[PDB]
Amino acid sequence: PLAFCGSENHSAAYRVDQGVLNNGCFVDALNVVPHVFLLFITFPILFIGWGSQSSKVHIHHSTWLHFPGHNLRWILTFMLLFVLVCEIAEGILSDGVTESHHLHLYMPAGMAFMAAVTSVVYYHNIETSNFPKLLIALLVYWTLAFITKTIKFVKFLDHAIGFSQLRFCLTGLLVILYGMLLLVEVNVIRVRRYIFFDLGVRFLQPFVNLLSKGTYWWMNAFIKTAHKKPIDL
């Protein structure tokens, strides 16, 4: 039937007679809402701005500007992806112990995972087009995700679930990871202050994003166009 937190209980666990946000299903349904906010603020502006760059309006390939904190932003985003796939597998092992698909264990972490991939490709599409006049929607996503994770963490600390059950440790890692993904305060205040405060080199390795430093995504163009062309000096 697949409901949020099951029909398996005496009749339902949906009742809120203790209050709002004492229900674990309600604090996980509140944990959904910045990820669905970032998906429906990110997918039309990415499909308008960078799905329009088809053939016969190609790209610029020079002056990759690199808004700072860039290496630690991608290192923290890959640590966020690792702790989110641990929350997927922890919610799957929490779900399989009874029955009936208690859906609130892994559906907010899956929506957080898809919001994290669209956040990092939204940051890369901002950062290769070199204008910072966006990205405050990403900032209010990180503050919304931080306040919903710290309300989940303080309601985990209320019932004494501390450090033996692993969803306390994973929400504590995600609270300190969203607090270190409030690194966009360096981009608005400390460096470059947008809110209120090269040449014909075609090598492109030391000025590219850190995934393309890792898996060499710029070399896909050179391995593409060495077909149907010989490579001269």
Binding site: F203, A226, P230, I231, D232, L233
Partner: protein, 49 residues
């Protein structure tokens, strides 16, 4: 094709050294040491590319 491009940039640097060691007294007469250093700068740059 990139390996063959590495061999065709690796050849004129060693032929430049075989030019400039046998012709050292006449490259110190026609005072072109800065121009030959500019030529080996271009050759080692293309080799490292």
């Amino acid at each position: 094709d990139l390996q063959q491009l590495d061999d065709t940039t690796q050849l004129p640097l060693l032929s430049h050294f075989a030019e400039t060691v046998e012709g050292l007294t006449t490259i110190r007469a026609f005072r072109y040491e800065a121009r030959f250093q500019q030529k080996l700068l271009e050759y080692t740059d293309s080799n490292n590319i």
